[PDB]
Short mmCIF file of C-alpha atoms in Angstrom, two decimals:
data_model
loop_
_atom_site.label_atom_id
_atom_site.label_comp_id
_atom_site.label_asym_id
_atom_site.label_seq_id
_atom_site.Cartn_x
_atom_site.Cartn_y
_atom_site.Cartn_z
CA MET A 17 -42.69 -3.69 14.60
CA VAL A 18 -43.15 -2.57 10.87
CA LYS A 19 -40.77 -1.25 8.08
CA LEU A 20 -41.65 0.74 4.94
CA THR A 21 -39.52 -0.88 2.23
CA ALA A 22 -40.86 0.84 -0.77
CA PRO A 23 -41.25 3.70 -2.00
CA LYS A 24 -38.50 5.85 -1.59
CA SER A 25 -39.33 9.73 -0.97
CA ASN A 26 -37.89 10.61 -4.38
CA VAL A 27 -40.31 8.01 -6.34
CA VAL A 28 -41.37 9.11 -9.85
CA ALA A 29 -45.15 8.64 -9.77
CA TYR A 30 -48.00 10.12 -11.72
CA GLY A 31 -51.67 10.64 -11.04
CA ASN A 32 -53.95 8.01 -11.66
CA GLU A 33 -51.24 5.48 -12.13
CA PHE A 34 -50.50 2.62 -9.57
CA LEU A 35 -47.89 3.17 -7.30
CA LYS A 36 -46.61 0.00 -4.78
CA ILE A 37 -46.03 0.31 -1.32
CA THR A 38 -44.11 -2.47 0.52
CA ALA A 39 -43.42 -3.30 4.07
CA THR A 40 -41.78 -5.94 6.24
CA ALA A 41 -43.13 -6.67 9.78
CA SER A 42 -42.36 -9.08 12.54
CA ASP A 43 -42.96 -9.48 16.32
CA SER A 44 -40.98 -11.40 18.94
CA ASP A 45 -43.66 -11.90 21.27
CA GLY A 46 -46.46 -13.27 19.01
CA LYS A 47 -47.63 -12.93 15.51
CA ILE A 48 -48.32 -10.05 12.85
CA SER A 49 -52.14 -10.34 12.11
CA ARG A 50 -51.83 -7.79 9.32
CA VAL A 51 -50.21 -4.71 8.02
CA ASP A 52 -52.33 -1.72 7.13
CA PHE A 53 -51.37 0.79 4.34
CA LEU A 54 -52.13 4.43 4.63
CA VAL A 55 -52.16 7.56 2.55
CA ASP A 56 -52.59 10.89 4.42
CA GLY A 57 -53.28 9.06 7.53
CA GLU A 58 -56.26 7.26 5.96
CA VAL A 59 -56.22 3.36 5.59
CA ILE A 60 -56.29 2.48 1.97
CA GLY A 61 -56.07 -1.34 2.62
CA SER A 62 -54.64 -4.22 4.36
CA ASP A 63 -52.35 -7.34 3.53
CA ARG A 64 -52.43 -10.13 5.95
CA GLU A 65 -49.63 -12.40 4.40
CA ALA A 66 -45.93 -11.57 3.76
CA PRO A 67 -44.68 -10.22 1.76
CA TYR A 68 -46.71 -7.45 2.47
CA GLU A 69 -47.57 -5.01 -0.42
CA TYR A 70 -50.45 -2.65 -1.76
CA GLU A 71 -50.93 -0.76 -4.86
CA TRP A 72 -52.31 2.70 -4.49
CA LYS A 73 -54.19 4.79 -7.20
CA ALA A 74 -51.80 7.73 -7.03
CA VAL A 75 -53.40 11.22 -6.60
CA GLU A 76 -51.44 14.07 -7.53
CA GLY A 77 -49.43 16.54 -5.07
CA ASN A 78 -47.81 16.13 -1.80
CA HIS A 79 -48.93 12.76 0.04
CA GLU A 80 -47.47 10.75 3.22
CA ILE A 81 -47.70 6.96 2.82
CA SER A 82 -47.21 4.90 6.02
CA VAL A 83 -47.57 1.53 7.24
CA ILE A 84 -48.66 0.03 10.52
CA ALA A 85 -48.16 -3.75 11.69
CA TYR A 86 -50.97 -5.06 14.20
CA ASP A 87 -50.25 -8.07 16.49
CA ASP A 88 -52.78 -10.96 17.49
CA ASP A 89 -54.40 -8.72 20.13
CA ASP A 90 -55.13 -6.24 17.31
CA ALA A 91 -52.80 -3.64 18.90
CA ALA A 92 -50.90 -1.05 16.63
CA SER A 93 -46.91 -0.59 16.02
CA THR A 94 -45.78 2.88 15.55
CA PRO A 95 -46.05 3.61 11.87
CA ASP A 96 -43.19 3.82 9.37
CA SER A 97 -43.93 6.62 6.91
CA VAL A 98 -42.47 8.38 3.88
CA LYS A 99 -43.42 11.62 2.14
CA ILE A 100 -43.82 11.61 -1.71
CA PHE A 101 -44.97 13.89 -4.70
CA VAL A 102 -47.14 12.78 -7.27
CA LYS A 103 -46.84 14.38 -10.49
CA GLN A 104 -50.15 15.63 -12.68
CA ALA A 105 -51.54 12.70 -14.78
CA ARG A 106 -50.03 12.54 -17.92
#
């Protein structure tokens, strides 16, 4: 399983500034190999070690941020996601 811990849906963010995405992940059968971080369904990057975190260069407008945990068989969890709105670059 995976849980998105940040950001919240009301996060204040601006274009071209970095937004931190954070997630927990765990698995009672075997081991989490990585957590992928997604924006609008596109993988922006991965983290292989807890605490799982990524920074995204924010782009203005509506976006959905998600996380997917992958096990040792490289099998995917159901995603956790949040919808945000990124303001125009200052």
